[PDB]
Amino acid sequence: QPQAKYRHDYRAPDYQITDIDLTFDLDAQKTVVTAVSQAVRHGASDAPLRLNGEDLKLVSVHINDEPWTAWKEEEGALVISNLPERFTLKIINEISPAANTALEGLYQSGDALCTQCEAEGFRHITYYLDRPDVLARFTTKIIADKIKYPFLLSNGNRVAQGELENGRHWVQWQDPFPKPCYLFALVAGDFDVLRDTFTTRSGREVALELYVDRGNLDRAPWAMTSLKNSMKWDEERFGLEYDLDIYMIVAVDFFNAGAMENKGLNIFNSKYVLARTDTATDKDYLDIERVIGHEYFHNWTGNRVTCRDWFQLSLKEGLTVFRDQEFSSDLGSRAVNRINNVRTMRGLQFAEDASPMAHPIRPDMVIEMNNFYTLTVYEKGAEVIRMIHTLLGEENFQKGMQLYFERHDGSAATCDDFVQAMEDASNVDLSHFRRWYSQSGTPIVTVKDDYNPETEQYTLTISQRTPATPDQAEKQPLHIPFAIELYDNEGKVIPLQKGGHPVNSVLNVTQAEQTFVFDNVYFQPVPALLCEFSAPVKLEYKWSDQQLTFLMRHARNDFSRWDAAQSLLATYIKLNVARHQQGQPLSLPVHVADAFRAVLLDEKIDPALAAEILTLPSVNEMAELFDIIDPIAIAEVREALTRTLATELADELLAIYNANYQSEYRVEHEDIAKRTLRNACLRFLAFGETHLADVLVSKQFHEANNMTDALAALSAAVAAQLPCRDALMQEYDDKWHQNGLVMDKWFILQATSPAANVLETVRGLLQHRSFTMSNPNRIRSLIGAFAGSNPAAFHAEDGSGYLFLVEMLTDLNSRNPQVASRLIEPLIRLKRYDAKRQEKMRAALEQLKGLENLSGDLYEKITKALA
Ligand SMILES: NCC[C@H](N)C(=O)O
Ligand code: NA
Ligand code: NA
Ligand code: NA
Ligand code: NA
Ligand code: NA
Ligand code: NA
Ligand code: NA
Ligand code: NA
Ligand SMILES: [Zn+2]
């Protein structure tokens, strides 16, 4: 019975709230909330005010200080009748932070109290218009025990404070910017604080404050550094300054998301704040940078301009993800960023778009809005903004940004508003392009080519289609920007032209079928196609091995070198999965191995690139290549391929490994790159002769002067099941058990182990001293990693994986439905698998469907999967 909501139902609110004054009398067992709201009727004069509320204990309702009699509580609501046109609403209610295991609303993180209000969490704090087109100026007074909660934080600036009898105190905050309530935050606790300053380019000095648990101040400076780098980049790239006087970040251990952009008071999962060279990898450092940037970039793309309704989520998320990618790419290695974002798109997002949960980047139907914080809305959303940037170019893109803020600053906007701004500013017609917002699924672009030596013309015949998805039976052609480059046989770019005029290298692929003709092609070209993954599409073109190795040697853009290597491997991945299914061992032509040898020995390739080419597609990227997924064949082919290259390239691998040794550890992009190349080599070296490999891996673990190098060694010992594995794993447990973020990496290694008894080990780990089901990070690192990242064990033929997940979800459905819904995702992909697997996955899903008190979050997914 939880009911679907539809985008086409959107209507302007009958009432607005312009100003809200909140008081919290804080206590873990019983918090008393007083909320005084100034309301204004915009709808019909007989329309009742309908407030949203969940798990609230209503104490009183007054209208202009009169105790109100004309109201009723109903499921999820408080409905107030017979109101004047303008009035003051006062609600007093109670809530219980300590009972809040779902971590939405006001809840407890360790000894702290903190909030999470996006999407619809504020209704768990008081009765309100909990929709993001209602924008109110907040004032927030917090009263609490001074010893337990010496810091009392909310949005904006401190405007008042006092002390009270019996050891209590209070602080009052005011945020001058109107905001939807999903941006409300409150934090109370006892913290260490790192304080710093950023001066904006126009000279405004912003006080920066990072609040962390006592004892964690040694892990704070990188996050502070990254915040300042974020603020500077946004000024340089987008012309945007911070708009308040104080920027607070609180790191908390118990958090369902990564982080949250609450105005002036961001709340982060401490996974995305805390780093020191002995605890955090280069990947953690760069994720901290990325997510600090992301929440900062929301200050404009989300906060100053917000979302009219939740179906417009991608208006803030695709754009803010695009911004975080551009930040990471400008500061770091653009190629490595782009590569990794492409791997995520093709390996994880394409899977979602082929699943029962498929939706467009602007959904049409939602049951539980927390189910739509997706790869699609985020990552595909950003690919869509990046297509706009491709079509318009940077200068016009920025004009469209400027026009967007000039029109929409201080309001709640739509995806369509943003596109209109881009189109009006640039004079590029985006009417057809808008179909990317409304249509789900991955287009498949098929390319055929012809060279005519008599006319000296190269003709590309490009076709597109998007297969139907369970949500949409009709699909139509998109406006696909399809970037090409043509190479002569010495590797020089052939100028693109037709009838004597230059032709843009971004082709407009707008029809089901079209041709593009290029003149003055004097010699048969080798094409690079879909350069920089210029659209989020599958490409079907029948490359020859030699065209691909030529691109690996000659392509001008680093991405194209990587991508060519991926197309080279895809053919042999597919070959060998079919072999595996018939009991046949790996077959790989000599010339393929040699193309990777050449990358190893090319001194002119950026190590950052070499490293990515020498990182094989993950099991998730390998799965995208197939209609039916054989997860056992894929996992075993991936290892066999790794062993084959390890044997054929052993000498070269060892030389490059040794040459990329660095005695100093720095978090600097060139150092990171060499280290990534080094550790790429290591993955293969772990599969050499057992005694060479065991010694080398073990040595790296024991002599590392940083967590990047130690984890890469530990991870190799696991992957190759080397004799040192058990000892190294026990040493890490002994050294690091008291540190959850660091033990997350060990839990992931256990969960993703190729060992025959992995499931047994993972079950035993539910009792490990560093694990608990009350913490979403731990849950995700052990259970979520087993189910989502070890598809070979999760899909064991005996069905033991599915039973284990059902067991875990039966607990989490009641405890924390959002983490439950993340964890169910592997089960909903059942139609990608063989019949016998499907049958057991359906049976698991039918069991979950019958749970008492089945959460809406799971219900929505289970219903789609079982259809
Ligand atoms: N689930 C993440 C929530 C937040 N609005 C962000 O974009 O990072
Ligand atoms: Na308002
Ligand atoms: Na109040
Ligand atoms: Na109610
Ligand atoms: Na800025
Ligand atoms: Na926002
Ligand atoms: Na860069
Ligand atoms: Na490719
Ligand atoms: Na996949
Ligand atoms: Zn975001």
Look up the CATH number of domain 12-191: 2.60.40.1730
Domain 192-276 is found in CATH 3.30.200.20: no
Question: Which pair of tokens denotes residue 589?
Answer: 């032509």
CA 549 – ligand 8 centroid, Å = 12
Residues with CB under 6 A from ligand 1: 118, 257-261, 294, 317, 373
DSSP state string for 227-265: HHHHHHHIIIII-----SSEEEEEEES--SSSEE--TTE
How far does Cα 749 stand from its chain's mean position? 21
Give the Cα separation of 751 and 732 in Å (integer).
16
CA 75 – ligand 4 centroid, Å = 5
192-276 and 543-867, same CATH topology: no
Look up the CATH number of domain 543-867: 1.25.50.10
CA atoms within 13 A on the CB side of 389: 17
Residue 251: cis peptide before it, omega within 30 degrees of 0: no
CA 265 – ligand 3 centroid, Å = 20
What sections of 169-255 are H helices per DSSP?
221-233
- Residue 713, annotated as binding a ligand: no
Alpha-carbon Rg for the chain, nearest whole angstrom, is: 28
Residues 6+ apart with CB under 8 A from 275: 219, 222, 223, 284, 285, 288
Closest CA to 430 of 417, 442, 411, 412: 417
3-state secondary structure of 665: coil
Closest ligand to Cα 303: 6
Residue recorded with tokens 């808008």 = 434
Strand (E) positions, 295-354?
306-307
What sections of 518-557 are H helices per DSSP?
545-554
How far does Cα 826 stand from its chain's mean position? 17
- Residue 298, annotated as binding a ligand: yes
Closest CA to 15 of 93, 119, 86: 86
Question: Which pair of tokens denotes residue 59?
Answer: 């104490």
3-state helix, strand, coil in the chain (%, to 5): 45, 20, 35
Closest ligand to Cα 411: 2
**Residue with the nearest Cα to atom 1 of ligand 1?**
257
Q: Which CATH architecture has domain 277-440?
A: Orthogonal Bundle (1.10)
CATH code matching the domain that covers 441-542, chosen among 3.30.465.10, 2.60.120.560, 3.90.700.10, 2.60.40.1840: 2.60.40.1840
Question: Which pair of tokens denotes residue 1?
Answer: 């019975």
- Resolution of the determined structure in angstroms stands at 2.2
Give the Cα separation of 302 and 317 in Å (integer).
8
Residues 6+ apart with CB under 8 A from 12: 42, 43, 133
Atom of ligand 1 nearest to the CA of 257: 1
CB 696 within 8 A of CB 723: no
Question: Which pair of tokens denotes residue 729?
Answer: 């794993």
Question: Which pair of tokens denotes residue 579?
Answer: 């072999």
Residues 6+ apart with CB under 8 A from 547: 526, 527
Q: Which residues surround ligand 9, an ion (CB under 5 A)?
A: 351, 620, 623-624
The domain locations on the chain are 12-191, 192-276, 277-440, 441-542, 543-867
